[PDB]
């Protein structure tokens, strides 16, 4: 049974027992590469072999001497019973070399089962051997510097033995079928109790009255003060147990390892229910393990392939969160706080952090020009830009109409009433002839500016200045001007080469039913990378009326597809296409569909899906307040979102910003009732004094209460670089407990200089109650 032992007084030296006994030293390797011949015990630890000994074949039991000198001194008992004292340190100054190599031979050849040193006196060695016919099984000898000092357990089997940590003359031993406690004062004086578990007897260092034993896969605990029946029994394991050990650096902690297992089972007996835990140190079975005597909660395990791993046993960890997305946890007796890395790439941050950052930057309060909110978003996201531009266009149309409701109904509602459109049979390559609903839809899409202009030229030039060549060319072609698109492609290829060959390919448009160009373009059209080119060629190659390739392309912005369907597709199928697109947008929760649904119940469902996907309520709350119809604001979900956002603001103590949001919401939504609070009542009439001398009750004309400092009746007139009618210094103030009060300024000064209620015979510390 291979085993590893630490140095009793050295933290860096340990020994591994096998057919060859190997003494190793532990060194750091964090700042140095893998040293030659050094075993990487862990990621940053290296073990350097100190010595090898092969003079002990068939080792049976091993012990390490206690006293400091000499260093690396051990005792090995063999199968024949010979017990030899060996050393592995480089000791050129041995104190008593006579003990070096000293061997004790049993009178009768029997195998020594266990061997141990006396802690109180290092010169005493106790060894339990095999059961002789009529001879003692336990021998206590003196190493000094002829015969064992003591012999006991005749015709018995000493499975295991241990010393009393405090008593220098008390021993515990495991007989063939019983457990015995013996005193050196009198050999006859012994307490023997029959038991079945006799292997691996050990005592908890912190509790000298606690002992452990195990038989097969069952483990029992004993209390020496009342050792008559086992105090407790652990759960029996399938595989037989192999080693049991107390942790010296932690109270009430026991460790167990069984046969052919890669997991060590730990038990917490410090309850007086035993807490059970398991630790996996490596990917292979552990041959043995050893607690570090002094290092805190450190244990080293050994694998049969001569690979050793040393590790610390962590305790149970407790967790807690904070409203600033900082995770604080506790492990043992230390506290650690974890936050997000402050990297430049802010697009991957959590939704809560982004919401906080947007709140700090007045996100959504720019009512002068709505589209700037995407700039205020801080990050780049097409959905937000699309939403804000849509809102800006709708607001612009509302303002124009007011200068000169249906807009917020959405594209679907607007085009639901469209009538009188005739499809084109052939393309003439060369707006106001179209129905009003489609003109309004195009205005919403942003292709055409306000008015009845029948030219998209300003839009094309804006795109050209924007540098989006392909999109501008696609729009121009959709407006049925091939030469304009070719010119735009040439202009784009002039700056920054594929655009030229694309343009020269574009001139091959033919109407032949079996056109070679048509066939090849249809076949290899999708191989391009830019989606706009793909949809352009799809439109060119598509037959009359059947434009499914253009319509059902997901890589193109919804606005362009909507406009293209508006100007070309027939209404009878346009309604169906709009319905299908609206449904597939709603089920996905993409925000670009707001243009379709509008601020209606469909918009509410789309927003709910969006919130479910991402958990953002700030954008939903700000969006739904933009001139929504009264019925929309009456829905439960919208108000729930608003309340959750307000609670979130209260969590971060952004009190002033919450007040600004409340002002904005109250201005936009009349349905909301402001907070309810207390009001003052007249003593005589009993009515409210809220809204003919000022200092008189409006109802009874009787005097009001008087300031406790100025002795003047309080009062305030009731109904921009101007004068102020009612200064803050003249408002009512009172202590909510003592019910005394007066003017704001007077009491402010008085409590700045004093700490008691200003009324005589009042003991309230009014201003200290609130903090």
């Amino acid at each position: 049974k291979p085993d590893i032992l630490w140095a009793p007084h050295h933290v860096d030296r340990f020994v591994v027992c096998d057919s060859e006994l190997s003494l190793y030293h532990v060194e750091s390797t964090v700042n140095s590469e893998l040293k030659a011949g050094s075993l990487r015990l862990s990621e940053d630890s290296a073990a350097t072999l100190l010595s090898i000994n092969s003079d002990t074949p068939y080792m049976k039991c091993v012990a390490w001497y206690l006293n400091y000198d000499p260093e690396c001194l051990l005792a090995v008992g063999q199968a024949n019973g010979r017990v030899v004292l060996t050393s592995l340190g480089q000791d050129h100054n041995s104190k008593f070399k006579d003990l070096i190599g000293k061997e004790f031979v049993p009178k009768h050849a029997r195998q020594c089962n266990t061997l141990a040193w006396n802690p109180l006196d290092s010169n005493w060695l106790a060894a339990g051997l095999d059961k002789h016919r009529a001879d003692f099984s336990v021998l206590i000898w003196d190493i000094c510097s002829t015969k064992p000092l003591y012999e006991l357990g005749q015709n018995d089997a000493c499975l295991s033995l241990c010393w009393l940590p405090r008593d220098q003359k008390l021993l515990l031993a495991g007989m063939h079928r019983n457990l015995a406690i013996f005193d050196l004062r009198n050999t006859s004086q012994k307490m023997f109790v029959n038991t079945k578990a006799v292997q691996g007897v050990t005592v908890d260092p912190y509790f000298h009255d606690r002992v452990a034993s195990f038989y097969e896969g069952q483990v029992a605990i004993w209390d020496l003060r009342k050792f008559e029946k086992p105090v407790l029994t652990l759960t029996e394991q399938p595989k037989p147990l192999t080693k049991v050990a107390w942790c010296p650096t932690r109270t009430g902690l026991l460790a167990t390892l069984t046969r052919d297992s890669n997991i060590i089972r730990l038990y917490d007996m410090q309850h007086t229910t035993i807490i059970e835990r398991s630790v996996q140190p490596c990917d292979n079975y552990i041959a043995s393990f050893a607690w570090h005597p002094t290092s805190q909660n450190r244990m080293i395990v050994v694998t049969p392939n001569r690979t050793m791993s040393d590790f610390t046993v962590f305790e149970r960890i407790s967790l807690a969160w904070s409203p600033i997305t900082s995770l604080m946890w506790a492990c043992g007796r230390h506290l650690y706080e974890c936050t997000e890395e402050e990297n430049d790439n802010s697009l991957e941050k959590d939704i809560a952090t982004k919401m906080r950052l947007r709140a700090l930057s007045r996100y959504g309060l720019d009512t002068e020009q709505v589209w700037r909110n995407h700039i205020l978003a801080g990050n780049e996201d097409p959905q937000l830009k699309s939403l804000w531009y849509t809102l800006h266009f709708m607001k612009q149309y509302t303002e124009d109409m007011d200068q000169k409701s249906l807009v917020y109904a959405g594209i679907k509602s607007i085009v639901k009433s469209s009538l009188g459109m005739v499809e084109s049979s052939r393309h003439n390559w060369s707006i106001q002839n179209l129905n009003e609903e489609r003109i309004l839809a195009l205005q919403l899409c942003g292709w055409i500016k306000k008015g009845t202009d029948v030219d998209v030229g300003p839009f094309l030039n804006s795109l050209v200045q924007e540098g989006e060549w392909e999109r501008a060319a696609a729009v121009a072609l959709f407006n049925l001007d091939i030469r304009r698109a070719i010119q735009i492609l040439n202009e784009g290829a002039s700056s920054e080469l594929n655009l030229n060959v694309v343009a020269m390919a574009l001139s091959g448009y033919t109407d032949e039913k079996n056109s070679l160009w048509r066939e090849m373009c249809s076949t290899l059209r999708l191989q391009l990378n830019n989606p706009y080119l793909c949809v352009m060629f799809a439109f060119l190659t598509s037959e009359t009326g059947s434009y499914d390739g253009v319509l059902y392309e997901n890589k193109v912005a919804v606005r362009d597809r909507v406009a293209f369907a508006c100007k070309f597709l027939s209404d009878t199928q346009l309604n169906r296409y709009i319905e299908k697109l609206t449904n597939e947008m709603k089920e996905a929760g993409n925000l670009e569909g707001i243009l379709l649904t509008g601020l209606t119940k469909d918009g509410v469902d789309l927003m709910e899906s969006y919130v479910d996907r991402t958990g953002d309520v700030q954008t939903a709350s700000y969006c739904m307040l933009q001139g929504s119809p009264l019925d929309v604001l009456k829905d439960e979900r919208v108000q729930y979102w608003i309340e959750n956002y307000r609670n979130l603001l209260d969590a971060w103590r952004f009190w002033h910003k919450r007040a600004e949001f409340d002002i904005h919401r109250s201005k936009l939504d009349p349905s909301s009732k402001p907070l309810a609070q207390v009001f003052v009542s007249c003593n005589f009439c009993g009515k409210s004094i809220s809204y003919s001398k000022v200092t008189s009750c409006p109802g009874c004309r009787k005097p009001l209460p008087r300031c406790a400092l100025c002795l003047i009746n309080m009062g305030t007139p009731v109904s921009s670089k101007d004068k102020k009618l009612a200064q803050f210094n003249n408002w009512f103030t009172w202590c909510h407990n003592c019910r005394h009060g007066g003017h704001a300024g007077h009491m402010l000064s008085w409590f700045r200089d004093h700490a008691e209620c200003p009324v005589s015979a009042c003991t309230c510390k009014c201003m200290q109650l609130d903090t």
Partner: protein
């Protein structure tokens, strides 16, 4: 994308549980010596202890805060079959005072939790005998008086409970209870009770059949206006469930609401018994801690799929 730091707080004994206040400015920690400590954060950002005392005869398991609207209130459950309520009074040195003790349990009180704010000042305790007791304080200005409102038997050793933080007008109060029994038989380990207004009694609504291993921790996620509820279960593997209510027919309103149960994430990266699970404020990041001495942070993605985002170790050394 998560980095760690060590806070200069000194403790002499092992820490069992730590808990934050609502605003994240106050901390409560229970130690191994039946001691409770309160820590405050200064404006500079440093932490300082402000109080300390010994509470119970047995071990102290859990300590939790109450909502600030009711003042400064702490609730502590102990192994000595008691649950104590403490309130801070200052005259300025803080002077915490015990106000009441609940002793109705016949076994060790395993866990204690506070109800959500919108239901008043209610409290729940699950014991080892399989009993969940719900108390209420009728008067918020007199915390010395409490009345046992409800009592539920689970027929299994309760180990942890969690309220439903939803505050909508359409969701009845919900409480979920776990168990840690290791019986060889395959029996359910998680049950959910939904309050019924028509009967004013809690009734079992849904039981998680797919969960049969012992359960150590269970946590609802904050609602935040979603259309369904998210639950996190800690076992040999971290599991996440989503519960969606079904449309209740207007023909007749009966017993508990029927639900659709779907699992959306099952992680086994700990390779051990996961011990604690918790949610952030928005219910979008999940923190899990198991026996491997590691803390793992999970989050959703663009495809609405759950994947790990952070791994740390108890010592604070990054992985």
């Amino acid at each position: 994308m998560f980095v760690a730091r060590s806070i200069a707080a000194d403790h002499k004994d092992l820490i069992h549980d730590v808990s934050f206040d609502f605003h994240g400015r106050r901390m409560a920690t229970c130690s191994s010596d039946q001691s409770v400590k309160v820590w405050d954060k200064s404006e500079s950002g440093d932490w300082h202890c402000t109080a300390s005392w010994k509470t119970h005869s047995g071990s102290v398991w859990r300590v939790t805060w109450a909502h600030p609207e009711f003042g400064q209130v702490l609730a502590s459950c102990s192994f000595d079959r008691t649950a104590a309520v403490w309130e801070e009074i200052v005259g300025g040195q803080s002077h915490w005072v015990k106000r009441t003790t609940l002793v109705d349990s016949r076994t060790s009180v395993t866990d204690v939790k506070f109800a959500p704010k919108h239901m008043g000042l209610m409290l729940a305790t699950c014991s080892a005998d399989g009993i969940v007791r719900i108390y209420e304080a009728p008067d918020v200005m007199n915390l010395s008086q409490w009345s046992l409102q409800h009592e539920i038997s689970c027929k299994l050793s309760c180990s942890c409970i969690s309220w439903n933080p939803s505050s909508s007008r359409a969701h009845s109060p919900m409480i979920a209870v776990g168990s840690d029994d290791s019986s060889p038989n395959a029996m359910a380990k998680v049950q959910i009770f939904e309050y019924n207004e028509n009967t004013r009694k809690y009734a079992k609504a849904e039981t998680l059949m797919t969960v049969t291993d012992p359960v150590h921790d269970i946590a609802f996620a904050p609602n935040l206006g979603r259309s369904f509820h998210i639950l996190a279960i800690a076992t040999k593997d971290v599991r996440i469930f989503t519960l969606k209510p079904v449309r209740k027919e207007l023909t007749s309103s009966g017993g508990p609401t029927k639900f659709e149960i779907h699992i959306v994430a099952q992680f086994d990266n700990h390779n051990s018994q996961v011990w604690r699970v918790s949610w952030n404020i928005t219910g979008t990041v999940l923190a899990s801690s198991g026996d491997d001495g590691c803390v793992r942070l999970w989050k959703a993605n663009y495809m609405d799929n759950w994947k790990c985002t952070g791994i740390l170790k108890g010592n604070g050394s990054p992985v």
